[PDB]
Structure formats: C-alpha cells, structure tokens
Scaffold this motif. Structure first.
Motif, PDB file in Angstrom:
ATOM      1  N   UNK A 124       0.846  -1.203   0.000  1.00 20.65           N
ATOM      2  CA  UNK A 124       0.000   0.000   0.000  1.00 20.65           C
ATOM      3  C   UNK A 124       0.878   1.249   0.000  1.00 20.65           C
ATOM      4  N   UNK A 125       0.564   2.259  -0.803  1.00 18.03           N
ATOM      5  CA  UNK A 125       1.403   3.466  -0.747  1.00 18.03           C
ATOM      6  C   UNK A 125       0.604   4.675  -1.159  1.00 18.03           C
ATOM      7  N   UNK A 126      -0.049   5.269  -0.159  1.00 18.32           N
ATOM      8  CA  UNK A 126      -0.993   6.336  -0.406  1.00 18.32           C
ATOM      9  C   UNK A 126      -0.536   7.701   0.078  1.00 18.32           C
ATOM     10  N   UNK A 127      -1.142   8.715  -0.522  1.00 20.79           N
ATOM     11  CA  UNK A 127      -0.882  10.097  -0.205  1.00 20.79           C
ATOM     12  C   UNK A 127       0.549  10.557  -0.450  1.00 20.79           C
ATOM     13  N   UNK A 128       1.322   9.852  -1.268  1.00 20.02           N
ATOM     14  CA  UNK A 128       2.691  10.315  -1.563  1.00 20.02           C
ATOM     15  C   UNK A 128       2.591  11.473  -2.568  1.00 20.02           C
ATOM     16  N   UNK A 129       3.390  12.511  -2.368  1.00 20.52           N
ATOM     17  CA  UNK A 129       3.259  13.709  -3.172  1.00 20.52           C
ATOM     18  C   UNK A 129       4.447  13.852  -4.063  1.00 20.52           C
ATOM     19  N   UNK A 130       4.248  13.698  -5.358  1.00 21.56           N
ATOM     20  CA  UNK A 130       5.378  13.776  -6.294  1.00 21.56           C
ATOM     21  C   UNK A 130       5.957  15.197  -6.441  1.00 21.56           C
ATOM     22  N   UNK A 131       5.221  16.236  -6.032  1.00 22.57           N
ATOM     23  CA  UNK A 131       5.771  17.603  -6.110  1.00 22.57           C
ATOM     24  C   UNK A 131       7.016  17.716  -5.246  1.00 22.57           C
ATOM     25  N   UNK A 132       7.128  16.823  -4.253  1.00 22.95           N
ATOM     26  CA  UNK A 132       8.263  16.836  -3.356  1.00 22.95           C
ATOM     27  C   UNK A 132       9.572  16.329  -3.932  1.00 22.95           C
ATOM     28  N   UNK A 133       9.533  15.875  -5.179  1.00 24.31           N
ATOM     29  CA  UNK A 133      10.691  15.294  -5.845  1.00 24.31           C
ATOM     30  C   UNK A 133      11.285  16.206  -6.917  1.00 24.31           C
ATOM     31  N   UNK A 134      10.670  17.373  -7.110  1.00 29.23           N
ATOM     32  CA  UNK A 134      11.086  18.296  -8.161  1.00 29.23           C
ATOM     33  C   UNK A 134      12.068  19.317  -7.654  1.00 29.23           C
ATOM     34  N   UNK A 135      12.954  19.780  -8.544  1.00 25.70           N
ATOM     35  CA  UNK A 135      13.893  20.875  -8.262  1.00 25.70           C
ATOM     36  C   UNK A 135      13.216  22.219  -8.402  1.00 25.70           C
ATOM     37  N   UNK A 136      13.966  23.290  -8.202  1.00 27.82           N
ATOM     38  CA  UNK A 136      13.361  24.612  -8.254  1.00 27.82           C
ATOM     39  C   UNK A 136      13.007  24.980  -9.700  1.00 27.82           C
ATOM     40  N   UNK A 137      13.993  24.896 -10.591  1.00 23.70           N
ATOM     41  CA  UNK A 137      13.731  25.272 -11.967  1.00 23.70           C
ATOM     42  C   UNK A 137      13.004  24.200 -12.810  1.00 23.70           C
ATOM     43  N   UNK A 138      12.246  24.665 -13.793  1.00 27.12           N
ATOM     44  CA  UNK A 138      11.658  23.743 -14.725  1.00 27.12           C
ATOM     45  C   UNK A 138      12.359  23.839 -16.061  1.00 27.12           C
ATOM     46  N   UNK A 139      13.558  24.442 -16.092  1.00 22.08           N
ATOM     47  CA  UNK A 139      14.399  24.516 -17.279  1.00 22.08           C
ATOM     48  C   UNK A 139      14.617  23.088 -17.761  1.00 22.08           C
TER      49      UNK A 139
END
Ligand SMILES: [Zn+2]
Length: 257
Positions: free
Chosen positions: A171-186
């Motif tokens: 089971x793996x719920x409520x994990x937030x992928x926004x937490x894996x991104x860097x600052x820039x979207x370059x």
C-alpha cells in the motif's frame, strides 16, 4: 527474460526487441553546445496538485510508485507537448557507485541517479494504447546528485524494506510527487523511447537542467533492493541504467537560453 546483467543486459536487448537499434532510442548524451535553445517552446506545466498514489512495487528491474490515472489529477501540459499527459508511475535508475547511475548525460557527465515520471497522452484512452504511438508518452527525467537529503523522498525510502525482492508490493498512499522536483523547470527535450524493453519509440523526453540532491543514505537504501525474487540467489539491484544511445538524426531542444 531481460535485465541489466552481463547475459541479459542492454547489449542483448536487440535480439528480442530489434527496435533497440532504432532511430529514436533513449537515453542520449546531451551536448550543451549543440542543444540549441528553442524560442518556440511554451512553458511546461507540471500539475501534480491532486496526485493519488496507489502503491509501490519491485518488478525485478526497479521500484515503481503507481498512481491513479483514471482522471486528470496529476498531469503534464505545455512545453513541446501536444495536449494532456497523465502521470501513471515513477521509478529511478541508479548505480553501484555515485559516479554513475543516470541514463541521460550532460556533456558526458553522469549523475548518481535519474528519476523518471511516466505520463500518457489522454488522447488515447489508457496507457496501453498510448505506449504504441509516437506521441503517446511524456517522461519527465530528473537527475539526482548526492548531498543534502531530499525530504520529499524520505517516505519512499522508508518503505523499501517491505519490497526487497521481485514481485513484492505494498500500500502506498498520499505520496506527493511535487516533493521530488527541483526549483527550476528549465529542460531539454527530444523524441525518444522507453529505456527498457520493449524500447518502443513513443516518448517525448523532457529532462530538467536542475538536479535534486538526495543523501548518500537515501541512495544507499536503493542499493539494498534486489533484482531477484524471494528465495533465489541474492542479486543487488544496482546499475539498472541503459547507457547513452546514438542521437542519429535527432535534435535536442533547450527551453532556456
Ligand atoms: Zn526509466
């Protein structure tokens, strides 16, 4: 069947999947001198605000965090993309040593690991129809270097003991992928494929310029996973990356100057 070993690795894949020697294979080395900035690109939109994670699992090659893609809840728009792509899952590629592990390279420089967020074109109904089309998938790639811990990654790291071997899930719920991104979207972008068999050439790659930092301790948890199933000879899940492929006639476009 296939894997990353000496007898089932990347140099053997063409035998079962002849497209391995195709025209738009991934990964690729990113040469910053020739990767021209493209002023036609629109801004990339990363919309993960309602992402719904379902589970985490060991498939014998890596771990995959799966997401509910039944609606637009975590999608990618903009950039070079025509339309909307839903996040179906993410997983990583990593090495035995820090010195290698990423699939894409920048001026030949290899990172310790590379995160891949896999998305499919809602034009197609579901992942299944989408993976067979040239405009079918959008994978967001993000390099990992070793340094400070990545707080958003901790939730994943703390459940890997539960999926040590091929076939395990949890089971793996409520994990937030926004937490894996860097600052820039370059980002850099080019037409590619799945880096793993079946290697279908249906992926628009979007590789971010800014790596995230993760701690030696998080990556070390990665390394304790196994490629094998319970009871089989213990094989450490390490070096689950395919090396760079010929660019061929393709162009890599930069979203930044
Ligand atoms: Zn991948």
């Amino acid at each position: 069947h296939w894997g990353y070993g000496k007898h089932n690795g990347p140099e053997h894949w063409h035998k079962d999947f002849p497209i391995a020697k195709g025209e738009r294979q991934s990964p690729v080395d990113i040469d910053t001198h020739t990767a021209k900035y493209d002023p036609s690109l629109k801004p990339l939109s990363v919309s993960y605000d309602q992402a719904t994670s379902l589970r985490i699992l060991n498939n014998g090659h890596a771990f995959n965090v799966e997401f509910d893609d039944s609606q637009d809840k975590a999608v990618l728009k903009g950039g070079p993309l025509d339309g909307t792509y839903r996040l179906i899952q993410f997983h990583f590629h990593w090495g035995s040593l820090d010195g290698q592990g990423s699939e894409h390279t920048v001026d030949k420089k290899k990172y310790a690991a590379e995160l891949h967020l896999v998305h499919w074109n809602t034009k197609y109904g579901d992942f299944g129809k989408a993976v067979q089309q040239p405009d079918g998938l959008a994978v967001l790639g993000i390099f990992l270097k070793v340094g400070s811990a990545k707080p958003g990654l901790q939730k994943v790291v703390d459940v890997l003991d539960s999926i040590k071997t091929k076939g395990k899930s949890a089971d793996f719920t409520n994990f937030d992928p926004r937490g894996l991104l860097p600052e820039s979207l370059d980002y850099w972008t080019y037409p590619g494929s799945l880096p793993t068999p079946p290697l279908l050439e249906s992926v628009t790659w979007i590789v971010l310029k800014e790596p995230i930092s993760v701690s030696s301790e998080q990556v070390l948890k990665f390394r304790k996973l196994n490629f094998n199933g319970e009871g089989e000879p213990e094989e450490l899940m390490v070096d689950n990356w395919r090396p760079a492929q010929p660019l061929k006639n393709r162009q890599i476009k930069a979203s930044f100057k």
